[PDB]
Symmetry: none
Subunit: 91 residues, 4 copies
């Protein structure tokens, strides 16, 4: 499913909408694209049961980037975990 791909966008942590005030920036990566091909027995049978008579697979992160630690303007440090995709896949 090569249509399911990873895209990177350069953002400020403040663009994440998490309510933090900081100058930290990051490259945010996300998954998008089609998952029209069956990658498991389960999806094959889901299809067949349609052509016979939802739950379709989706392009999502299967691996996440490393933790990102940043300093707030309020002196509090924060760690974002599983906030950005490292690898994408149909699941």
């Amino acid at each position: 499913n090569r249509g399911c791909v990873l895209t990177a966008i350069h953002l400020n942590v403040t663009d994440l909408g998490l309510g933090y005030e900081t100058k930290e920036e990051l490259i945010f990566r996300y998954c998008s694209g089609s998952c029209e091909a069956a990658e498991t027995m389960y999806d094959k049978i889901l299809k067949n049961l349609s052509r016979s008579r939802v739950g379709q697979a989706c392009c999502r992160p299967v691996a996440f980037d490393d933790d990102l630690s940043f300093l707030d303007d309020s002196l509090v440090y924060h760690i974002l975990r599983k906030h950005s995709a490292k690898r994408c896949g149909c699941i």
Copy 2:
């Protein structure tokens, strides 16, 4: 918590699966379906926020899928040929 993501069971003949098997084997096939509107990860919260801000239009959203699969099903078909179905039926559903 996306309570709408549920497991649904259907009793089928393995021949109902359209996999080409010639057997009398039957099984309870289970599949996952339902809504996953609620963000369950930092990643999904961010996607919701970037869509609202128009920096990334609503990307693959989380979907209701199996998080666990029933055990492998081994059987001999009508010609005594051995076959195994792996990750063919849902055991547990989750927004992923």
Copy 3:
């Protein structure tokens, strides 16, 4: 835990005496209710655990439908319409 699960069935499978080939997806509520939301439930759980009350799980909370799916309609073999109301769960809760 209390969750909604579903099963594909034939209307005939319901045992209501209908003669039809129509099917449906029946959804139901099942699971335990171990959280006591009121003092009454906390007391029943304590009385039960201390054996001051004997009945298995005397009056404890049950996993039940708190909302129902749309009503099911179908035509039987005699070409008579039937509507099954509040026949399937849409949401489950410990009550």
Copy 4:
């Protein structure tokens, strides 16, 4: 089947940890609810008998008794709210 039962208990029988000599009348709902009021319960019963399948109606409080205040072996007053049934119903 589903009825209210009133019994005389010591507050200490409740297992709330409070040391006291106070008592109370505790009323609870119990009994069978094998009457299928809704199509849903009719169906559950049929699926259980046909071994096709799961929780049928249960006898529960649909109304509660007034609050009960009680004194501890200390300077603190305690109050029990919705701790005793006043009316029962199969739900």
